[PDB]
Amino acid sequence: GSARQLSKLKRFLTTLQQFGNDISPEIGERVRTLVLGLVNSTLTIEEFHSKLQEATNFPLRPFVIPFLKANLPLLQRELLHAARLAKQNPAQYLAQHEQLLLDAS
């Protein structure tokens, strides 16, 4: 498969969202929101590329859409580890609520 080969960005993403709260509150909440969002929450690359684009300083970064597009399945993996280091559940790590579970209807 193409997991490890694409995991090259996984690490960066993990630390990016983990330390993203250090650089600042704005970009922080956003980074984690988008990242963790498309990971478990209902989010799309485009949307994750929008807020981020206006969240991170400087002009659009090189390969944004195609970035998480091939790392989506790689980011949803580390999420299972975050919960262990967050003292919470892997699916509740981001949700942290009931109403925000499966409100399809």
Curated annotation (Swiss-Prot):
Tissue expression: Most abundantly expressed in brain. Lower levels in lung, heart, testis and ovary.
Phenotype upon changing Q53A: Abolishes interaction with corepressor
Function: Transcriptional corepressor which facilitates transcriptional repression via its association with DNA-binding transcription factors and recruitment of other corepressors and histone-modifying enzymes. Can repress the expression of MMP7 in a ZBTB33-dependent manner. Can repress transactivation mediated by TCF12. Acts as a negative regulator of adipogenesis. The AML1-MTG8/ETO fusion protein frequently found in leukemic cells is involved in leukemogenesis and contributes to hematopoietic stem/progenitor cell self-renewal.
Highest taxon of source: Eukaryota
Family label: Belongs to the CBFA2T family.
Record's protein name: Protein CBFA2T1
Quaternary structure, from the entry: Homooligomer. Homotetramerization is mediated by nervy homology region 2 (NRH2). Can interact with CBFA2T2 and CBFA2T3; heterotetramerization between members of the CBFA2T family is proposed. Interacts with TCF12, SIN3A, HDAC1, HDAC2, HDAC3, NCOR1, NCOR2. Interacts with ATN1 (via its N-terminus); the interaction enhances the transcriptional repression. Interacts (via its N-terminus) with ZBTB16; the interaction increases the transcription repression activity of ZBTB16. AML1-MTG8/ETO fusion protein interacts with CBFB.
Domain notes per entry: The TAFH domain mediates interaction with transcription regulators.
Species whose genome carries this gene: Homo sapiens
Subcellular location field: Nucleus
Disease in which the protein is involved: A chromosomal aberration involving RUNX1T1 is frequently found in acute myeloid leukemia with maturation (AML-M2). Translocation t(8;21)(q22;q22) with RUNX1/AML1 that results in the production of AML1-MTG8/ETO fusion protein.
Mutation effect (F12K): Abolishes interaction with corepressor
Taxonomy of the source species: Eukaryota, Metazoa, Chordata, Craniata, Vertebrata
Reported effect, T56Q: Abolishes interaction with corepressor
UniProt effect for mutating K8 to A/D: Loss of interaction with TCF12
Record domain TAFH: where: 3-98
